[PDB]
Amino acid sequence: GWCGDPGATCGKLRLYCCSGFCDSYTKTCKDKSSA
């Protein structure tokens, strides 16, 4: 079970985000901030 690291393209490519947040503004995997 592999995970996608920050800086990878999310959307049309395989692998999911470790935190569960994919940015559609640049089509990449990003980390979410807690308030």
Side-chain angles (χ1 to χ4, degrees), residues 1-34:
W2 295 272
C3 182
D5 286 270
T9 178
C10 185
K12 287 179 180 180
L13 203 87
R14 286 181 179 185
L15 270 157
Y16 290 90
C17 240
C18 269
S19 300
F21 170 62
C22 281
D23 239 291
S24 190
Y25 207 90
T26 50
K27 289 180 180 180
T28 48
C29 242
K30 291 196 180 180
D31 290 90
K32 249 180 178 286
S33 54
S34 54

